[PDB]
Amino acid sequence: NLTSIDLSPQTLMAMHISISSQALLNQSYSNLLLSQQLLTSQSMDPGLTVKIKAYQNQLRQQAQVFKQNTVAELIGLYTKASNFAALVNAVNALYSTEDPQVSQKGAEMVAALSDVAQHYQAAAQAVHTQLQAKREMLEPLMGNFLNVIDAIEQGLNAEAKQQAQTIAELNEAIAKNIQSIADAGFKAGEGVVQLGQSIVAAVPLGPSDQASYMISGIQAISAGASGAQQAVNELKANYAKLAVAYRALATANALLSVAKSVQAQAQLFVDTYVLTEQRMALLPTEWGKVAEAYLTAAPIINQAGSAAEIKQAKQIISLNAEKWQLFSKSIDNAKANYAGNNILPEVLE
């Protein structure tokens, strides 16, 4: 009986919001990697200088790819959801009970949307397979650069290892702060996201070439109106300490200080890329659930041949339409955010 058909978006609304959350942030981490000053100096360890410049270059290539290609691929999948909402409205409009065969024509269209949902499932799979491929190339790229930093650190005296750990610990703290700020800006999908950037630290380089390597860091847009004031205060305090800690490690190991600064930025990008891939892994299945739900619903909608059965079906469809319209708005805002969040503006005090 009709009482059992589910023409709803299921967990698509929430599933798209959990994707937006990481993809939008990863958009900002891509902008950070592309804004960061390159290492120019050729007056330091020739062997390690080439490993940093090579890694920094390989990261900007992947940041550009994510920013220009992968974001567009996602906006494509979101549009497909709007499109589906629009089609459900049409089914609603068809139930103006003017038509003497209204239930056979209704069944036919629900059966057709089952097909569309199956295409949107396959479209999502295609995007996930590309994200999975990049993940499998990014993990070993970062993994290899970590083994390079580690080999260098394993040969330092105790004073330098402590200066290096202080830095590693602060980068880990700063990442938790940024995440807290981004969550507050995002407002669980209903927010209009913006993150900024500024120079936060510097690495003096032994004695003009590149007097100093300038370190770019994410910043909140409003140092007193973001709805995560404690995180903004911790971020300010942590950047202050980060500046001091690089000045310390730099006295003796300047080039390692640089390598660490780059790896901290890579970590944010690769970690949230992995989370983007993982949230996207569930999307094809969720479209497939809409496909199965719509396939099962159609023959049941066809059995409705009475006055009260057609009235009940109009009601079941009108309700599920409202659900898709609400979802369509969540999508409109996500697309506006992917457009607006394409730039990571400078912030000044």
CATH classification at residue 136: 1.20.1170.10
Resolution of the model in angstroms: 2.6
Question: Is 54 inside a domain boundary?
Answer: yes
DSSP states along 177-215: HHHHHHHHHHGGGTS----EEEEEEEEE------SEEEE
Question: Is 349 inside a domain boundary?
Answer: no
With left for phi above 0 and alpha for psi between -120 and 50, is residue 205 left, alpha or beta? Answer: beta
**How many residues belong to the chain?**
349
Question: Is 346 inside a domain boundary?
Answer: no
Can you list the pairs that 89-95 forms with residues at least 24 positions away whose Cβ atoms lie under 8 Å?
Answer: 89/321, 89/324, 89/325, 91/317, 91/321, 92/317, 92/318, 92/321, 95/310, 95/313, 95/314, 95/317, 95/318
For residues 19 and 74, the answer to whether their CB atoms sit within 8 Å is yes
Consecutive H or E run containing 217: strand 212-219
What does the longest C-alpha to C-alpha distance in the chain come to?
A: 90
Question: Is 347 inside a domain boundary?
Answer: no
Question: Is 345 inside a domain boundary?
Answer: no
Q: Which residue has the tokens 């390598």?
A: 259
Instruction: Tell me how many domains the chain contains.
Output: 1
CB atoms within 10 A of CB 242: 22
Question: Is 66 inside a domain boundary?
Answer: yes
Q: Which residue has the tokens 């089609």?
A: 87
Residue 57 to residues 38, 53, 68, 201, 284: CA-CA distances in angstroms?
8, 6, 17, 21, 33
Q: Which residue has the tokens 């004073």?
A: 159
3-class DSSP state of 23: helix
Question: Is 192 inside a domain boundary?
Answer: yes
Tokens standing for residue 79: 């549009």
Residues flagged as binding site for Ca(2+):
341
Helices (H), the chain: 12-35, 46-65, 71-94, 102-153, 158-186, 229-250, 254-281, 283-303, 307-340
Question: Is 71 inside a domain boundary?
Answer: yes
State which residues form the domain around 43.
Answer: 2-340
Comparing C-alpha atoms, which of 9, 55, 14, 50 is closest to residue 36?
A: 55
